[PDB]
Ligand binder design. Sequence first.
Ligand SMILES: *C[C@H]1C(=O)C2CCN1CC2
Ligand SMILES: *C[C@H]1C(=O)C2CCN1CC2
Ligand SMILES: [Zn+2]
Ligand SMILES: [Zn+2]
Ligand SMILES: [Zn+2]
Ligand SMILES: [Zn+2]
Lengths: 192, 189, 193, 192
Amino acid sequence: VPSQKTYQGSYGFRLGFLHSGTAKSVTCTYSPALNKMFCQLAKTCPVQLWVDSTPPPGTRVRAMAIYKQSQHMTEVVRRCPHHERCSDSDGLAPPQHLIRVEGNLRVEYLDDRNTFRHSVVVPYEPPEVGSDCTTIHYNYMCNSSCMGGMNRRPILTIITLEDSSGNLLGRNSFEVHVCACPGRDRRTEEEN
Amino acid sequence: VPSQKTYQGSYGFRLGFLHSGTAKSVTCTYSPALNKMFCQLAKTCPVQLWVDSTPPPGTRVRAMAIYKQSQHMTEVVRRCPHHERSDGLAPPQHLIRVEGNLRVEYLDDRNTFRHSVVVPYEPPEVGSDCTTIHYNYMCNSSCMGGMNRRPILTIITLEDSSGNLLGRNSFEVHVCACPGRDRRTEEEN
Amino acid sequence: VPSQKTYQGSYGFRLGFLHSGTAKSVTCTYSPALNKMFCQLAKTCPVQLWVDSTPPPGTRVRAMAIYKQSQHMTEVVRRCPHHERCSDSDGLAPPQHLIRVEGNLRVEYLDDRNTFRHSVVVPYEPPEVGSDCTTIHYNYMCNSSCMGGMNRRPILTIITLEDSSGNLLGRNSFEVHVCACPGRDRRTEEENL
Amino acid sequence: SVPSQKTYQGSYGFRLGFLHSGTAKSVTCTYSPALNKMFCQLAKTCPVQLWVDSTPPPGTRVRAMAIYKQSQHMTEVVRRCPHHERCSDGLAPPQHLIRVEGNLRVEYLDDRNTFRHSVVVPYEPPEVGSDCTTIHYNYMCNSSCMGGMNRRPILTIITLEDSSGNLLGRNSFEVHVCACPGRDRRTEEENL
Ligand SMILES: *C[C@H]1C(=O)C2CCN1CC2
Ligand SMILES: *C[C@H]1C(=O)C2CCN1CC2
Ligand SMILES: [Zn+2]
Ligand SMILES: [Zn+2]
Ligand SMILES: [Zn+2]
Ligand SMILES: [Zn+2]
């Protein structure tokens, strides 16, 4: 089972999210109280990278899903059978992978030859001028409800920072729920 | 610039404030003469919602700061970079927080870049006749590279669960060392 | 496990440090209360050598690190796999060594054949004309937060004065913390006391 | 380029107070209101009171530094004589004239650029009961120390600063370090 232990490490690595609120129209909204991202099928989910010091050119950013509940943690998070067999592929992403990256021509996907887990990796780039963080636009390609994929089981997204040689630099995670109305779900789940 | 114009609307929405006086020791005090709240950095600022009739379940209460001077009214009110650089829930750039409400929600406007903080409207307790919220102001009015002595207003909106405006009120805010003394002196002129 | 016992010996060997303070910007700062140096990755850490009389010609100054905690002490302190990667930088320093000396073209580095410990040695040279101590510029080449290296574990630098044959003439010791903002971390850690 | 001695109450009404100790033969430390002048013994406790109209925030710091009073000596750094300066309490540099007794959070600075000594402690508010914050300063040479101050008068400058080192308050007082404070105080007042 992949580690989900938070380490900031040498570059002071942590995640941030837009302060998007819960109006009906929002595409994607993070809940600080729940450390949980609410997003829509195949839509833009911006995840921010914040660092105290600049990892060198060659550094890479990996995303992997895992089931949160301990009785499922061993099972590979993958797309439901309906969504594997869509004409929805961008040509770079394997059709079985839940997590894509949008708008990055240097994206790399991995089926682990040993554990069989899926992941998606992009080069690390520093913040643009007049920004203080690096944004990756993720896409989740199934609904939390999909019969036979996740099937309403909670997942975590693990984000790892790694150097050009595979050495781990830092790690963070957040829960994610993929739904029709992210605004609505976040407001409701918070009222507990 | 966002709408600042007062309206009690359908539910009879008004703001009320504790009658705290100007003793040396007061945390926060309101001047009804000035419609101005004097308060201390990061400290409890009580604000009372008053309604003639009860809003529905899902009513939200939003607070936003704006510069009172017309030459600064289009500049976004934010924390100075000193104070920006922290309760886990608030963005470190936001001036106004809510204390004591684990359902608080913060907004960075995608197109205006204005900051606001919102909470569910809850009706008054059995024994209360109003709804209180604890605001905190997280910069001093004097903070260099922030407010920088420019006066602000707090706009308080009542909105329904779909974001339709139901009511709006506003007060000036001065964040200072000794609110007691600042209110008495300003009342003298 | 290397001896860390203080030893002034025949020449009255002691360590001093700059009185640098804790302002936000400072590159390096020593807490007298914590016998702890706070410093930045690959930046200058000045360590002063103070003697009562001048060691003999051919005298030498060694620096070695050990983990402080009892259950890490017999492990060798080294750079993380991330930072040990060969760089266009050094050319004198082995890429595994945590501790370098800067601005000294006679530096020597040692991987001990028996203990595998790392260390870095320079000739001892007396105080420059006028001045009362001898400054060495150490650089520490991983952060204390490096995953796979020190990994948030605490370390001491042991400083030894030795003769030309390697016999102990004196010893001193200090704790080291390698972080982004030494001034902020010293002031925060002292706010305990 | 000489530190400023200009009194500056600034934003919080920064004042100094001192004890009303009189001139009895046995006094270790006595302040002259007429002369704005402290009289004190080598290495003994010198209480100095911080008075404010508003409480400055935590992170506020209190610094002390000596300068020479006369203007042909003002660029010279005030330091201990070579006799006194010999190696101490183990928090204070041995060259430093001014120390703080009874504070494990004391910090000592040799300025990289001006070469000036100073000692700084956190500002604490007064006791929930008391009207002022006391610091116990100790002066570590006599005014008469051949090699150091060498009978030249000095001033102690007390500055209130923020966490970032920006100036909140400044006040100063002359200091004469002597064997018999009460006698030196009454003799110097004698002329008025
Ligand atoms: C980088 C690598 C090399 O190629 C030599 C210099 C240092 N390191 C080992 C030998
Ligand atoms: C000033 C005088 C005193 O009162 C005692 C200490 C020093 N001197 C002699 C005795
Ligand atoms: Zn699906
Ligand atoms: Zn501020
Ligand atoms: Zn490292
Ligand atoms: Zn002296």
